[PDB]
Coordinates of C-alpha atoms (C1' of nucleotides) and ligand atoms in Angstrom, one line a residue:
Chain A
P13 CA -13.7 3.6 4.6
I14 CA -12.9 0.8 6.9
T15 CA -9.5 0.4 7.6
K16 CA -7.7 -3.2 8.0
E17 CA -6.7 -2.1 11.7
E18 CA -10.8 -1.9 12.1
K19 CA -11.1 -4.8 10.4
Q20 CA -8.7 -7.3 11.9
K21 CA -10.3 -6.1 15.1
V22 CA -13.8 -7.4 14.4
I23 CA -12.3 -10.9 12.6
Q24 CA -10.0 -11.6 15.5
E25 CA -13.4 -10.7 17.6
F26 CA -15.8 -13.0 16.1
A27 CA -13.4 -16.0 14.9
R28 CA -14.2 -19.4 15.9
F29 CA -10.6 -20.3 16.6
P30 CA -7.3 -18.5 15.8
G31 CA -6.8 -18.1 12.3
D32 CA -10.1 -18.6 11.4
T33 CA -11.4 -15.8 8.7
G34 CA -14.7 -17.5 7.1
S35 CA -16.4 -18.5 10.2
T36 CA -20.1 -18.0 9.4
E37 CA -20.0 -15.6 12.3
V38 CA -16.5 -14.0 11.2
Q39 CA -18.9 -13.3 7.5
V40 CA -22.0 -12.3 9.2
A41 CA -20.2 -9.5 11.7
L42 CA -18.3 -8.4 9.2
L43 CA -21.0 -8.3 6.6
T44 CA -22.9 -6.3 9.6
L45 CA -20.0 -3.3 9.9
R46 CA -20.3 -2.5 6.0
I47 CA -24.1 -2.8 6.7
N48 CA -23.8 0.4 9.5
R49 CA -21.5 2.2 7.8
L50 CA -23.3 2.5 4.4
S51 CA -26.4 2.6 6.1
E52 CA -24.8 5.7 8.2
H53 CA -23.8 7.0 4.9
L54 CA -27.5 6.9 3.5
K55 CA -28.4 8.9 6.5
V56 CA -27.4 11.9 4.7
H57 CA -26.6 11.4 0.7
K58 CA -30.6 9.7 1.3
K59 CA -30.0 10.6 -3.1
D60 CA -27.6 8.2 -3.2
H61 CA -29.3 5.6 -5.0
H62 CA -26.8 3.3 -6.8
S63 CA -24.8 2.5 -3.4
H64 CA -28.2 1.6 -1.8
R65 CA -28.8 -1.6 -4.2
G66 CA -25.3 -2.7 -2.3
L67 CA -26.6 -2.4 1.0
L68 CA -30.2 -4.5 -0.1
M69 CA -27.6 -7.2 -1.4
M70 CA -25.6 -7.1 1.5
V71 CA -28.7 -7.7 3.7
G72 CA -29.3 -10.5 1.6
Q73 CA -26.6 -12.1 2.1
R74 CA -26.7 -11.7 6.2
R75 CA -30.0 -13.1 6.1
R76 CA -29.2 -16.3 3.9
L77 CA -25.9 -16.8 6.3
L78 CA -28.3 -16.2 9.3
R79 CA -31.0 -18.9 8.1
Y80 CA -28.1 -21.2 7.3
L81 CA -27.0 -20.8 10.6
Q82 CA -30.2 -20.9 12.6
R83 CA -30.7 -24.6 10.4
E84 CA -27.3 -26.3 11.6
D85 CA -26.9 -25.1 15.1
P86 CA -29.8 -23.2 16.6
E87 CA -27.2 -22.2 19.8
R88 CA -24.4 -20.3 18.1
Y89 CA -27.3 -18.4 15.9
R90 CA -29.1 -16.8 18.8
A91 CA -25.3 -16.5 20.2
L92 CA -24.4 -14.0 17.2
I93 CA -27.7 -12.4 17.1
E94 CA -27.4 -11.4 20.5
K95 CA -23.7 -10.3 20.2
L96 CA -24.6 -8.3 17.1
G97 CA -28.1 -6.7 18.5
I98 CA -29.9 -7.7 14.6
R99 CA -33.5 -9.2 14.6
Chain F
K8 CA 6.5 11.7 -38.3
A9 CA 7.9 10.7 -34.9
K10 CA 6.0 10.3 -32.3
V11 CA 6.1 12.0 -28.5
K12 CA 7.3 9.4 -26.6
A13 CA 9.9 7.8 -28.8
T14 CA 12.2 10.8 -28.8
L15 CA 11.7 11.2 -25.1
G16 CA 13.4 10.0 -21.7
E17 CA 12.0 8.4 -18.7
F18 CA 9.6 10.7 -17.1
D19 CA 6.9 10.8 -14.9
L20 CA 3.1 10.8 -16.3
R21 CA 1.7 11.8 -13.4
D22 CA 3.9 15.1 -12.6
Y23 CA 1.4 17.7 -13.5
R24 CA 4.5 20.2 -12.7
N25 CA 7.1 19.3 -15.2
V26 CA 5.9 21.5 -17.9
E27 CA 8.9 21.2 -20.1
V28 CA 7.8 17.4 -21.0
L29 CA 4.0 18.2 -21.0
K30 CA 4.5 20.7 -23.6
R31 CA 5.7 18.5 -26.0
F32 CA 2.2 16.6 -25.8
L33 CA 0.6 19.8 -26.6
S34 CA 0.1 20.5 -30.5
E35 CA 0.3 24.5 -32.2
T36 CA -2.9 25.0 -29.8
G37 CA -3.9 24.0 -26.6
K38 CA -5.6 20.6 -27.7
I39 CA -3.7 17.5 -26.4
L40 CA -2.4 15.2 -29.2
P41 CA -4.2 11.5 -30.1
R42 CA -3.2 8.8 -29.6
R43 CA -1.6 8.3 -33.1
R44 CA 1.1 11.5 -32.3
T45 CA 1.6 10.5 -28.7
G46 CA 2.5 7.4 -29.4
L47 CA 1.3 6.4 -26.0
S48 CA -0.8 3.3 -24.8
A49 CA -4.4 3.8 -23.7
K50 CA -3.4 3.9 -20.3
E51 CA -1.0 6.3 -20.6
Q52 CA -3.4 8.4 -22.4
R53 CA -5.6 8.5 -19.8
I54 CA -3.3 9.3 -17.5
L55 CA -1.8 12.0 -19.3
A56 CA -4.5 13.9 -20.4
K57 CA -5.8 14.0 -16.8
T58 CA -2.0 15.4 -15.8
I59 CA -1.7 18.2 -18.5
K60 CA -5.3 19.1 -17.4
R61 CA -4.4 19.6 -14.1
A62 CA -1.4 21.8 -15.2
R63 CA -3.7 24.0 -17.5
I64 CA -5.6 25.0 -14.0
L65 CA -2.1 26.0 -12.5
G66 CA -1.5 28.1 -15.3
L67 CA 1.1 25.9 -16.4
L68 CA -0.2 24.8 -19.8
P69 CA -2.4 26.8 -22.1
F70 CA -6.1 25.9 -22.5
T71 CA -5.9 27.2 -26.0
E72 CA -4.0 29.1 -28.4
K73 CA -3.7 30.9 -31.7
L74 CA -2.3 29.4 -35.1
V75 CA -0.4 31.5 -37.1
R76 CA -0.5 29.9 -40.5
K77 CA -3.1 30.5 -43.4
Chain S
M21 CA -4.3 10.8 7.7
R22 CA -3.5 10.3 4.4
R23 CA -0.6 12.1 2.3
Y24 CA -1.5 15.4 0.1
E25 CA -0.1 17.9 -2.3
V26 CA -0.8 21.4 -1.6
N27 CA -0.3 23.8 -4.6
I28 CA -0.4 27.5 -4.0
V29 CA -0.2 30.3 -6.4
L30 CA -0.4 33.9 -5.7
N31 CA -0.2 37.5 -6.5
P32 CA 3.6 37.8 -7.3
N33 CA 3.9 41.7 -7.0
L34 CA 4.5 40.9 -3.1
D35 CA 7.6 42.8 -0.9
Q36 CA 9.1 40.5 1.4
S37 CA 6.8 42.2 4.3
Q38 CA 3.6 40.7 2.7
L39 CA 5.3 37.3 1.4
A40 CA 6.4 36.9 4.8
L41 CA 3.2 37.2 6.1
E42 CA 1.1 35.3 3.3
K43 CA 3.5 32.4 3.8
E44 CA 3.4 32.1 7.4
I45 CA -0.3 32.5 7.2
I46 CA -0.3 29.5 5.4
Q47 CA 1.9 27.7 8.0
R48 CA -0.6 29.0 11.2
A49 CA -3.6 27.3 8.8
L50 CA -1.8 24.1 8.7
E51 CA -1.4 24.2 12.2
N52 CA -4.4 24.8 13.2
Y53 CA -6.0 22.0 10.5
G54 CA -3.0 19.4 11.8
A55 CA -1.2 19.2 8.8
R56 CA 2.2 17.8 9.4
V57 CA 4.3 19.0 6.8
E58 CA 7.1 16.6 5.3
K59 CA 9.1 18.6 2.1
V60 CA 8.1 21.7 0.2
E61 CA 9.3 23.4 -3.1
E62 CA 9.4 26.9 -3.7
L63 CA 9.5 27.9 -7.5
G64 CA 8.8 31.5 -7.1
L65 CA 8.0 33.6 -10.1
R66 CA 6.6 31.6 -13.3
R67 CA 5.0 32.3 -16.7
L68 CA 1.4 31.5 -16.6
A69 CA 0.0 30.3 -19.8
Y70 CA -2.8 32.1 -19.6
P71 CA -3.6 35.8 -17.3
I72 CA -4.7 34.7 -13.9
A73 CA -5.9 37.8 -11.8
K74 CA -5.2 40.2 -15.2
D75 CA -1.6 38.8 -13.9
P76 CA 0.3 37.5 -16.9
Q77 CA 2.6 35.3 -13.7
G78 CA 2.4 33.6 -10.5
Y79 CA 4.4 32.7 -7.2
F80 CA 4.1 28.9 -6.6
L81 CA 4.4 27.1 -3.6
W82 CA 4.2 23.5 -3.1
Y83 CA 3.8 21.5 0.3
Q84 CA 4.2 17.5 0.3
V85 CA 1.6 17.5 3.8
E86 CA 0.1 14.3 5.7
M87 CA -2.9 15.6 7.6
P88 CA -6.1 13.9 8.5
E89 CA -8.9 13.4 5.8
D90 CA -11.9 14.9 7.0
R91 CA -10.5 18.2 7.0
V92 CA -8.9 18.8 3.6
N93 CA -12.1 20.9 2.2
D94 CA -12.0 23.1 5.0
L95 CA -8.4 23.9 4.9
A96 CA -9.0 24.5 1.3
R97 CA -11.6 27.0 1.8
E98 CA -9.3 28.5 4.7
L99 CA -6.7 28.7 2.4
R100 CA -8.7 30.9 -0.6
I101 CA -10.0 33.0 2.0
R102 CA -6.6 35.6 1.4
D103 CA -7.0 37.9 -1.4
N104 CA -3.6 37.4 -2.6
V105 CA -4.3 34.1 -2.9
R106 CA -4.9 33.1 -6.2
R107 CA -5.4 29.0 -6.7
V108 CA -5.4 26.5 -4.2
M109 CA -5.1 22.9 -5.6
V110 CA -5.1 20.0 -3.4
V111 CA -4.5 16.6 -4.6
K112 CA -3.9 13.4 -3.3
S113 CA -0.2 12.2 -3.5
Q114 CA 0.3 9.3 -5.7
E115 CA 3.2 6.9 -6.9
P116 CA 5.0 8.1 -9.9
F117 CA 4.2 6.0 -12.9
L118 CA 6.9 5.8 -15.1
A119 CA 6.5 5.5 -19.1
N120 CA 9.2 5.0 -21.6
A121 CA 10.7 3.2 -19.2
Chain Q
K26 CA -5.4 63.0 -38.5
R27 CA -4.0 60.1 -36.7
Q28 CA -0.8 58.3 -38.3
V29 CA -0.4 55.2 -36.4
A30 CA 1.2 54.0 -39.5
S31 CA 1.1 50.0 -37.8
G32 CA -1.8 48.3 -36.3
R33 CA -4.0 45.0 -36.8
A34 CA -7.0 44.0 -39.3
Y35 CA -9.5 41.7 -38.3
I36 CA -11.4 39.5 -41.1
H37 CA -14.9 38.5 -39.7
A38 CA -15.9 35.8 -42.4
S39 CA -19.6 34.5 -41.9
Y40 CA -21.6 32.8 -44.7
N41 CA -23.6 35.6 -45.5
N42 CA -21.3 38.3 -45.3
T43 CA -17.6 39.3 -44.6
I44 CA -16.5 42.5 -43.0
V45 CA -13.3 44.0 -42.0
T46 CA -12.0 46.1 -39.4
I47 CA -8.5 47.8 -38.8
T48 CA -7.1 49.1 -35.8
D49 CA -4.3 50.7 -34.4
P50 CA -1.8 48.1 -32.2
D51 CA -3.6 48.3 -28.6
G52 CA -7.0 47.2 -30.7
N53 CA -9.1 50.4 -31.1
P54 CA -10.4 50.6 -34.7
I55 CA -9.1 53.3 -37.3
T56 CA -11.5 52.2 -40.5
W57 CA -13.4 49.8 -41.8
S58 CA -15.4 47.9 -44.9
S59 CA -17.8 45.3 -45.5
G60 CA -19.9 43.6 -48.4
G61 CA -22.3 46.6 -47.4
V62 CA -20.5 49.0 -47.5
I63 CA -19.3 48.5 -50.8
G64 CA -22.6 48.5 -53.3
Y65 CA -23.8 45.0 -52.8
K66 CA -26.9 44.2 -50.7
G67 CA -28.1 40.6 -50.5
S68 CA -26.5 37.5 -50.8
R69 CA -24.0 39.2 -53.1
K70 CA -22.2 39.9 -49.6
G71 CA -21.6 36.5 -49.1
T72 CA -19.7 36.5 -52.2
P73 CA -15.8 36.3 -52.2
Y74 CA -15.5 39.2 -54.8
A75 CA -17.3 41.2 -52.3
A76 CA -14.6 40.4 -49.1
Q77 CA -12.0 40.9 -52.1
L78 CA -13.1 44.5 -52.6
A79 CA -14.1 44.9 -48.5
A80 CA -10.8 44.3 -47.7
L81 CA -9.4 46.5 -50.6
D82 CA -11.6 49.3 -49.3
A83 CA -11.0 49.0 -45.6
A84 CA -7.1 48.9 -46.8
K85 CA -7.0 51.9 -48.3
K86 CA -9.1 53.8 -45.9
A87 CA -6.1 52.7 -43.9
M88 CA -3.8 54.4 -46.2
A89 CA -5.3 57.6 -45.6
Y90 CA -4.4 56.8 -41.6
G91 CA -0.4 56.3 -43.3
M92 CA -0.9 52.6 -42.6
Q93 CA 1.9 50.4 -43.5
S94 CA 2.6 47.5 -41.1
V95 CA -0.6 44.8 -40.7
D96 CA -0.9 42.0 -38.7
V97 CA -3.6 40.0 -39.4
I98 CA -6.4 38.2 -37.4
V99 CA -9.2 36.1 -38.9
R100 CA -12.4 34.9 -37.4
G101 CA -14.7 33.0 -38.9
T102 CA -14.9 30.1 -41.5
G103 CA -17.0 31.5 -45.0
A104 CA -16.5 32.1 -48.7
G105 CA -13.9 34.7 -49.3
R106 CA -12.1 34.4 -46.0
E107 CA -9.1 33.3 -47.8
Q108 CA -9.8 35.4 -50.8
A109 CA -9.9 39.0 -48.2
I110 CA -6.1 37.3 -47.0
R111 CA -5.3 37.5 -50.7
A112 CA -6.6 40.9 -51.3
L113 CA -5.1 41.8 -48.1
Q114 CA -1.2 40.9 -48.8
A115 CA -1.4 42.9 -52.2
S116 CA -3.1 46.3 -50.7
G117 CA 0.2 47.6 -50.3
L118 CA -0.1 46.9 -46.7
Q119 CA 2.8 44.9 -45.7
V120 CA 1.1 41.7 -43.6
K121 CA 3.1 40.7 -40.8
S122 CA 1.5 38.1 -39.4
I123 CA -1.6 36.1 -39.9
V124 CA -3.5 34.0 -36.9
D125 CA -6.9 32.8 -36.5
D126 CA -8.6 33.2 -33.3
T127 CA -12.0 32.1 -34.6
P128 CA -14.0 31.7 -30.7
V129 CA -14.8 28.1 -30.4
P130 CA -16.5 27.2 -27.6
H131 CA -16.1 23.9 -25.5
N132 CA -19.9 23.2 -25.2
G133 CA -21.0 25.6 -23.6
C134 CA -24.4 27.1 -25.1
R135 CA -27.0 25.2 -27.0
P136 CA -27.0 26.4 -30.5
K137 CA -29.8 27.5 -32.7
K138 CA -32.2 24.6 -34.0
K139 CA -30.0 25.2 -37.4
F140 CA -26.9 24.2 -36.1
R141 CA -28.2 21.1 -34.5
Chain X
rU4 C1' -40.1 40.9 -41.1
rG5 C1' -36.3 42.4 -37.5
rC6 C1' -32.1 45.3 -35.7
rG7 C1' -29.1 50.7 -36.5
rC8 C1' -28.1 58.3 -36.3
rA9 C1' -31.1 57.7 -29.2
rG10 C1' -24.3 55.2 -32.8
rA11 C1' -25.9 48.9 -34.3
rU12 C1' -22.7 45.0 -36.6
rA13 C1' -16.9 44.5 -36.7
rC14 C1' -12.4 45.8 -32.7
rC15 C1' -9.5 46.4 -27.6
rG16 C1' -10.6 46.5 -22.0
rG17 C1' -14.0 45.8 -17.3
rG18 C1' -18.0 43.5 -15.1
rA19 C1' -22.1 40.3 -14.3
rG20 C1' -25.3 36.2 -14.8
rG21 C1' -26.5 31.3 -16.2
rA22 C1' -25.9 26.9 -18.6
rA23 C1' -23.0 23.1 -21.1
rC24 C1' -17.4 20.5 -20.6
rG25 C1' -13.4 20.9 -26.4
rC26 C1' -8.8 18.4 -26.8
rC27 C1' -7.6 13.9 -24.4
rG28 C1' -12.6 10.5 -27.0
rA29 C1' -11.9 5.1 -29.3
rU30 C1' -14.9 0.7 -33.3
rG31 C1' -13.0 2.7 -25.6
rG32 C1' -14.3 2.4 -20.5
rC33 C1' -18.3 1.8 -15.8
rG34 C1' -23.7 0.2 -14.0
rA35 C1' -28.6 -4.0 -13.1
rA36 C1' -31.4 -1.1 -16.2
rG37 C1' -32.4 4.2 -16.7
rG38 C1' -28.0 5.9 -17.8
rC39 C1' -22.7 8.2 -16.5
rA40 C1' -17.3 13.2 -19.4
rG41 C1' -13.2 20.0 -17.1
rC42 C1' -10.8 19.3 -12.6
rC43 C1' -10.1 18.7 -7.0
rA44 C1' -11.4 16.7 -2.0
rC45 C1' -14.3 13.8 0.9
rC46 C1' -18.4 10.0 1.8
rU47 C1' -19.6 5.2 -1.4
rG48 C1' -21.5 1.0 -4.8
rG49 C1' -20.0 -2.7 -7.6
rU50 C1' -16.2 -5.4 -10.6
rC51 C1' -12.0 -8.0 -11.6
rC52 C1' -6.7 -10.3 -10.8
rA53 C1' -3.1 -13.3 -7.4
rC54 C1' -2.3 -16.3 -3.0
rC55 C1' -5.2 -22.0 -2.2
rC56 C1' -5.6 -19.4 4.2
rG57 C1' -10.6 -20.1 6.1
rU58 C1' -16.5 -21.6 6.2
rG59 C1' -18.6 -26.4 4.6
rA60 C1' -23.9 -26.9 0.1
rC61 C1' -24.7 -21.9 3.1
rG62 C1' -26.9 -22.6 -3.6
rC63 C1' -30.2 -21.4 -8.4
rU64 C1' -34.7 -18.8 -10.2
rG65 C1' -38.3 -16.1 -8.1
rA66 C1' -45.6 -15.1 -8.5
rG67 C1' -46.4 -11.1 -4.9
rG68 C1' -44.2 -7.4 -2.3
rC69 C1' -40.6 -3.1 -1.8
rG70 C1' -36.6 0.2 -3.8
rC71 C1' -34.7 2.1 -8.8
rG72 C1' -36.2 4.3 -13.3
rA73 C1' -34.5 9.1 -20.0
rA74 C1' -37.3 12.8 -21.6
rA75 C1' -41.8 15.2 -21.5
rG76 C1' -45.5 16.5 -17.3
rC77 C1' -47.1 18.6 -12.1
rG78 C1' -46.9 21.0 -7.0
rU79 C1' -44.1 24.7 -3.7
rG80 C1' -40.4 27.6 -3.8
rG81 C1' -35.9 29.6 -6.5
rG82 C1' -33.4 30.4 -11.1
rG83 C1' -33.4 32.3 -16.1
rA84 C1' -27.2 33.0 -20.5
rG85 C1' -28.2 30.2 -24.9
rC86 C1' -31.9 26.9 -27.0
rA87 C1' -37.4 27.0 -27.4
rA88 C1' -44.0 23.5 -27.5
rA89 C1' -47.5 27.5 -27.8
rC90 C1' -47.6 31.9 -29.8
rC91 C1' -46.6 37.1 -32.6
rG92 C1' -44.6 37.9 -37.1
rG93 C1' -41.9 37.7 -42.3
rA94 C1' -41.8 34.5 -46.7
rU95 C1' -42.8 30.7 -50.0
rU96 C1' -47.0 28.3 -51.6
rA97 C1' -52.9 27.2 -55.5
rG98 C1' -53.7 27.4 -50.0
rA99 C1' -49.2 27.4 -45.4
rU100 C1' -53.3 26.1 -39.8
rA101 C1' -45.9 23.7 -42.2
rC102 C1' -40.4 23.0 -43.9
rC103 C1' -37.3 28.6 -44.4
rC104 C1' -36.2 33.6 -41.4
rG105 C1' -37.1 37.3 -37.4
rG106 C1' -39.0 37.2 -32.5
rG107 C1' -40.8 34.4 -28.3
rU108 C1' -44.1 32.0 -23.3
rA109 C1' -44.0 27.6 -20.8
rG110 C1' -40.4 24.1 -20.2
rU111 C1' -35.1 22.9 -20.5
rC112 C1' -31.3 24.1 -15.0
rC113 C1' -31.4 24.2 -8.4
rA114 C1' -34.3 21.8 -4.2
rC115 C1' -38.1 19.1 -2.4
rG116 C1' -42.6 16.1 -3.5
rC117 C1' -45.0 13.6 -7.4
rC118 C1' -46.1 11.2 -12.0
rC119 C1' -44.2 5.1 -13.4
rU120 C1' -43.9 5.4 -19.7
rA121 C1' -40.2 4.1 -24.3
rA122 C1' -37.9 1.4 -30.8
rA123 C1' -36.5 1.6 -21.2
rC124 C1' -33.8 -2.5 -28.1
rG125 C1' -29.3 -6.9 -28.0
rA126 C1' -37.0 -5.8 -30.3
rU127 C1' -32.8 -12.2 -27.5
rG128 C1' -35.2 -13.0 -18.8
rC129 C1' -31.3 -15.6 -15.0
rG130 C1' -28.2 -19.4 -13.4
rC131 C1' -25.4 -23.4 -14.8
rG132 C1' -22.5 -27.5 -17.8
rC133 C1' -20.9 -28.8 -22.5
rU134 C1' -19.3 -28.1 -27.7
rA135 C1' -12.9 -25.8 -33.7
rG136 C1' -10.6 -22.1 -34.3
rG137 C1' -8.5 -17.0 -36.0
rU138 C1' -8.1 -12.0 -35.0
rC139 C1' -8.7 -6.7 -33.0
rU140 C1' -8.9 -4.8 -28.2
rC141 C1' -9.6 -2.4 -22.8
rU142 C1' -8.1 -4.7 -17.6
rG143 C1' -5.3 -8.5 -14.3
rG144 C1' -1.4 -12.4 -13.0
rG145 C1' 2.9 -14.5 -14.7
rU146 C1' 8.9 -18.2 -15.8
rC147 C1' 6.8 -11.8 -20.5
rU148 C1' 7.6 -14.8 -29.4
rC149 C1' 4.2 -16.0 -25.7
rC150 C1' 1.1 -18.6 -21.3
rU151 C1' -2.8 -17.2 -18.6
rG152 C1' -7.5 -15.0 -16.2
rG153 C1' -12.2 -11.0 -16.8
rG154 C1' -14.8 -7.8 -20.5
rG155 C1' -15.7 -5.4 -25.1
rG156 C1' -15.9 -6.3 -31.1
rC157 C1' -15.2 -9.1 -35.8
rC158 C1' -15.0 -13.7 -39.3
rG159 C1' -16.4 -18.1 -38.6
rA160 C1' -16.2 -25.7 -36.9
rA161 C1' -19.8 -28.9 -35.4
rG162 C1' -25.2 -27.6 -34.9
rC163 C1' -30.0 -24.4 -35.0
rU164 C1' -33.0 -21.4 -38.0
rA165 C1' -38.4 -20.1 -42.8
rA166 C1' -34.7 -17.4 -44.2
rC167 C1' -32.1 -13.1 -42.8
rG168 C1' -28.5 -15.0 -39.2
rC169 C1' -26.2 -16.8 -34.9
rG170 C1' -22.4 -19.3 -33.8
rU171 C1' -17.6 -20.5 -26.0
Ligands
MG3 MG1 -8.7 34.6 -3.5
MG4 MG1 -26.3 38.0 -46.7
MG5 MG1 -36.1 51.0 -38.3
MG6 MG1 -35.6 53.6 -33.5
MG7 MG1 -16.0 42.4 -24.6
MG8 MG1 -28.7 38.3 -15.1
MG9 MG1 -15.1 12.7 -29.5
MG10 MG1 -21.3 -4.1 -19.3
MG11 MG1 -29.2 3.7 -24.5
MG12 MG1 -13.8 5.0 -5.6
MG13 MG1 -14.3 1.1 -4.5
MG14 MG1 -8.4 -24.9 1.1
MG15 MG1 -12.8 -28.9 7.7
MG16 MG1 -31.3 -13.5 -7.5
MG17 MG1 -41.6 -8.4 -8.3
MG18 MG1 -41.2 4.0 -6.6
MG19 MG1 -39.3 9.9 -13.8
MG20 MG1 -37.4 16.0 -16.1
MG21 MG1 -41.6 23.4 -12.6
MG22 MG1 -33.5 32.2 -30.8
MG23 MG1 -38.2 29.9 -33.9
MG24 MG1 -46.2 31.3 -39.5
MG25 MG1 -48.5 34.8 -45.7
MG26 MG1 -47.2 23.9 -53.8
MG27 MG1 -44.7 -1.7 -14.4
MG28 MG1 -35.9 -18.8 -23.0
MG29 MG1 0.9 -8.3 -18.7
MG30 MG1 -13.5 -12.6 -24.1
MG31 MG1 -21.1 -13.5 -37.3
MG32 MG1 -23.3 -25.6 -41.0

RNA sequence: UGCGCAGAUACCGGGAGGAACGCCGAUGGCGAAGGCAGCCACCUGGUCCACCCGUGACGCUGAGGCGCGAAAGCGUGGGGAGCAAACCGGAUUAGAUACCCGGGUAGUCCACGCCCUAAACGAUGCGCGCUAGGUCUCUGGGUCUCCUGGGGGCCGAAGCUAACGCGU
C-alpha cells in the first residue's frame, strides 16, 4: 500500500510551510497519489468494481478542491497543476 | 454446567498451535461450541473460530468425530 | 517487509540424511526469497487429528520470519514443491490477543 | 468357514428400509440381512419390526461364523434405527460399543427437490 | 417404471472429478444498491473512534452523461459431480398436457463479451438542523455501578396518520 514513509515525503513536498498538513495543496497531492496507486491497481483487476467506486469519489474530491483553488488564487492553481501534471 | 472460559487460565485466543486449550472448545464431535457453552464474548468467538479452523488445517484439531452413544 | 510465521508439516518417516536435507532445502529457499529468520520452534513428531497422506502423524516446523510481502506466495509455492512436504501454511504474525485475562 | 468370532455390525437406516451388514474387524463383510431379505416387500421394509427381524436374521447368520463380540456402527435416520440396535443387544451378540457415523455433508452437493 | 446373476444395495481400501462451505452463525457483521460465509497470502475500497494539529465555506442536491447492477437468458471456448426447464417414462386421476416416483438436455460453474429487468422492498430519494425516555445488541474511547461516540433491534413522550402504525 502507501506507507507513512512515502506519505510524509509527499506532505513535506507540498506543505505551504513547515507543519502544514491541511493545505489545499497538500490535500490535492495526497489525493493524487492514491489516484495513481488505485489506477495502477485497476490496470490489472479490471473486474474489481467495488474499489473502482472509491476512485470515482477520490477524483471528485480532487476536482472540487482544484475548482476551489482556481477561484481563490489562480496562480497557485497553475503551480499545483504543473507540478502534478494533471488536466 | 460450567462454561469453558470459566474453568481455564489466561490463554492466547490467537495461538492456533496450543491444542490442549483449543481441544477444550471442541465438542464430543469436531464442532465448535456455541457462545452459550464457551462463555466467550462476540469478538472472542470470532477469533477462536478462525484459530480453531487454522489448527484444523495443520491437523491439530479434528474436522469431525464419531459419537460413541445412543 | 512484514513478519510472517511459516508452518511446515512433513512426512515423519525420514531418517537423518533425508530430514537434514529437507530442512537445509527449506533454508536455501528462504535465502533465495530473502526471508530473515528470527526464531524457530521444532516440535517434531505429533499425533494428527486426521490421516494426512494416509499417515497418522506429522513432523512439525515453525519459523518466525521477516520477508518481503510480494514474495510470500512465490515462497509458499516453492515450499509445496517437495514431495515429503505435506502442509505449508504461511500466516501474517499478529498480536497475542489474550482472553480470561 | 471363517471363525472371525468378533467384528463390526453396520446399521443403515433410511425411511424406506433398514439393512444390516456384519464384517470382520478390518471391515470386510461376513453376512447381511435387510427388510427385503426377510419376507417384507414394500413400505413394510421401513418398519421397525422389519429392522428388528433383519438385525436378528443377520445376527443368526453371524453366529454360524462364530461371532461373539460386536462393535455397532449406525448410519442414517429412520424408523427402527433404534429398534435395530435393541434387537442386536439381545441377539446374544455382546455389543462392544455403539457409534453414530452418519455422513453429513459440509454443504457440498445440491440436494434433490425433495430435500429442499 | 428403474437398477440388480455381466453380482447391485450395504461394508473396507485406493483413485478421479466437479460443485458447495457443516459447526462457529447470531434476532450478528460489511457494502451505495445488487449483494458478500472453509483457510492462507498479496493487491484494494469504504467506514468508525481519540487528539484539537493543519486548510478556511472549499458546502448540499443533482435533469443529462458515465460506471455498477440477483436470477434467468445470449455469443465463443472450456467444464460438467450433484441438482435440473424442455423432454422420455411410472403412477394418480373423470381426464393429469400437474402436484408424487424413476430418468434426463439446456442450464446451473469458469473465462471473455452482451443483456439493464425484479416484490432490485424499508413497497419509505439525498443532506442538515430540532424534539422525553426505557431496554437488548455490534464496535471504538473513557477517570470502566457507569459516561461518551458510531451502527443494528424492540417498547414508547410530544406530535403525525384515514386507520394499521411511525416515533433521535
Ligand atoms: Mg508436496
Ligand atoms: Mg420401502
Ligand atoms: Mg430387470
Ligand atoms: Mg440386464
Ligand atoms: Mg469408498
Ligand atoms: Mg470427469
Ligand atoms: Mg446457522
Ligand atoms: Mg448498512
Ligand atoms: Mg436482499
Ligand atoms: Mg483490508
Ligand atoms: Mg482498509
Ligand atoms: Mg483548530
Ligand atoms: Mg488561519
Ligand atoms: Mg453527491
Ligand atoms: Mg443520471
Ligand atoms: Mg453498463
Ligand atoms: Mg446481469
Ligand atoms: Mg447469471
Ligand atoms: Mg452460456
Ligand atoms: Mg436427478
Ligand atoms: Mg424429475
Ligand atoms: Mg408425465
Ligand atoms: Mg397414465
Ligand atoms: Mg380428481
Ligand atoms: Mg433503468
Ligand atoms: Mg419526501
Ligand atoms: Mg470499553
Ligand atoms: Mg443508536
Ligand atoms: Mg414502534
Ligand atoms: Mg399521542
